Motif scaffolding. Structure first.
Motif: not given
Ligand SMILES: [Zn+2]
Ligand SMILES: [Zn+2]
Ligand SMILES: [Zn+2]
Ligand SMILES: [Zn+2]
Lengths: 385, 385
Positions: A138-157
């Protein structure tokens, strides 16, 4: 206790790292591993074993109440002792920091990256099921609001299973299986994708190429501007029109407040004309004017309008508290500039930390004369005019 | 008063700029110009005209005793008002700053460049006669010790006429004519040239490519290491052997002090084993570990030796004052970490700002858990091990 390190990933959450360690070293789950780790630290009498967490949701040092430095000492020891080859453990952890985001939000740090506490997710943490299945962590980015889409798969978390149960990988595991219905978790605004890509650290026009801590700072700042959840669309819009788009926000703010001014012009405080905007922008997280482009533009605007309208800007009132945040100095430092003849109060009696004794023009010139740093200085915004 | 701006040069001293302004605008000398400028500011009732200097040697804001912010307000007004086209005036001035170079030296700033006050020349300022004759202006670099050779003409700067009279361009003018004998001032260590080129901001191996403020910081630091005037030769030598050359200074320092230790090991303070080296290196001028390579190497060494010799390093004693400088936090912040249960003192009674109540290992882990910034953090030195 002796462990094989998992394949290192620089973007892994601390929780995911421990989960993989447990999985690959024969522990039943991460909880059994954390309990065995606490028992290990007790067997070597490491001071801090008593507070070693056995709750995967409480593993980061920011979750420690009184024992945050026992926690980092524990990670250090574990790193240096219990693995065949030492892993990067401390670098994945999310710690508290001393830094602030204006006006009064606290902050945390992972590695060299600082985040506003307002963005740190409090409850269920989402995931990308594609990332989990393809990468196994799991990416640490998932802990932070503002990062709402996976930047690598271009879909919403994803936050919740189609059956209704919220899926937190920390509790339910990296295999992406829902704890309740036992089904695999299964799944397009480009603005959301743009800022997600930007937050991850990549170039994403029209968003500015700043250090990561100031990107999170801008998300926090935008939230404050709108006083609501981060709106990816108007954020991208704003920067597609930068800097004119900010020149309009400033001008519109001054003209509204000046017109709604019920008090005399001589009694106008800086807070009354530019309150939200100025004091909301000083630390994002710091005053480096190469990186805090909001403060740089605001200060460039204020220097060049200083003495218009018979000193409208220059005469705006401030108190000692506001000057200390402006100047990045101590209240005691302020007293020593007023008792000496460097800082002159308006009312000449013979310091109330809160009385509006000073004028913006004086504090601004004092900043130039006494408080510029290698980062917080006029030369870094004169090109903005 | 209305003036033609001279040809701008970004490296011109403030004194040289005013001299050229006087020369090219029909004033007899700079003193007559400064007096006329003070009279101009009085005629427009600019608050600060009373302290406007008429001594060319006292023109910078750092030379103002109590009126430094009247001085910057004056330069701003002059810039914005008295020229056909506005010049960059504030950017040439040397101001005081709040920053320090360890352990206790003050600092000044010009533009975005910070300098240790210990390097700011107090008496006669030297020059390069080739620069004066070819360019018609003086470099700000001539104000700072360490810059002893002109980096462009590769000759030593000149301080005194062959007749014995010291030549200060500020007083004697940019024409390079001696005031006493009326003769033109007339003129090769490559190490001196190397560090002069480096100080000017250019790549000069083996010296490190750091921001300018930290280059001056290293000059100040080297001076402290040797406790004498800056020695260009051993400085270049040192960096030609970096970083091993610094690993030897640390090891040799620890082994000497540990052997000369007359007190019990349990009573050893951090200051006793690494006093000069640690507390001389914290702010050069700040704790950014990408730029303060001395502190980064020292902290990398200390983390990795933390718990050797049954905690030799970890057990070294510190007081509240030392922790605040380490951590970049307030004494009040220290009290709040001790009254809560985050920071634990060694002697458990029931805070003397000066008593050695704490252990380096505790303060170090507290830094990790609570005081890392986007600049001052472990991830910026782990690659040094
Ligand atoms: Zn993904
Ligand atoms: Zn389900
Ligand atoms: Zn020269
Ligand atoms: Zn002479």
């Amino acid at each position: 206790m002796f462990l094989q390190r998992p394949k290192p990933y620089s973007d892994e959450s601390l929780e995911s790292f421990f989960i993989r360690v447990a999985n690959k070293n024969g522990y039943g789950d991460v909880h059994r591993f954390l309990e065995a780790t606490k028992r290990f630290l007790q067997d070597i009498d490491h001071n801090g074993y008593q507070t070693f967490p056995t709750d995967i949701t409480r593993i980061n040092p920011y979750s420690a109440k009184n024992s945050s430095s026992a926690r980092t000492a524990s990670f250090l020891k574990l790193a240096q002792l219990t693995f065949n080859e030492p892993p990067e453990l401390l670098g994945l952890a999310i710690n508290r920091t001393n830094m602030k985001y204006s006006p009064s939000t606290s902050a945390v740090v992972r590695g060299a990256e600082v985040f506003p506490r307002s963005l740190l997710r409090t409850h269920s943490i989402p995931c990308c099921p594609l990332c989990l299945r393809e990468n196994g962590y799991a990416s640490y980015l998932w802990h932070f609001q503002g990062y709402e889409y996976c930047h690598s798969h271009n879909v919403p978390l994803i936050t919740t299973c189609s059956c209704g149960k919220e899926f937190d990988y920390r509790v339910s595991g990296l295999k992406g299986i829902c704890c309740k219905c036992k089904e695999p978790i299964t799944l397009g605004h480009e603005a959301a994708c743009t800022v997600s890509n930007w937050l991850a650290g990549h170039e994403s026009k029209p968003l500015p190429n700043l250090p990561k801590s100031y990107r999170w700072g801008l998300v926090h700042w935008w939230m404050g501007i709108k006083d609501s959840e981060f709106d990816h669309f108007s954020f991208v819009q704003f920067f597609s029109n930068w800097p004119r788009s900010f020149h309009s926000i400033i001008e519109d703010e001054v003209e509204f407040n000046l017109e709604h001014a019920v008090v005399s012009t001589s009694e106008l405080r800086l807070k009354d004309l530019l309150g939200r905007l100025f004091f909301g922008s000083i630390r994002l997280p710091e005053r480096n004017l190469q990186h805090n482009i909001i403060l740089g533009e605001l200060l460039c605007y204020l220097e060049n309008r200083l003495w218009q309208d018979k000193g409208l800007i220059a005469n705006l009132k401030m108190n000692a508290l506001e000057a200390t945040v402006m100047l990045n100095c101590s209240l005691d430092q302020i007293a020593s500039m007023v008792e000496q003849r460097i800082l002159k109060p308006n009312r000449k009696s013979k310091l109330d930390v809160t009385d509006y004794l000073f004028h913006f023009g004086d504090i601004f010139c004092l900043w130039l004369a006494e408080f510029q740093s290698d980062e917080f200085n006029r030369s870094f915004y004169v090109s903005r005019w």
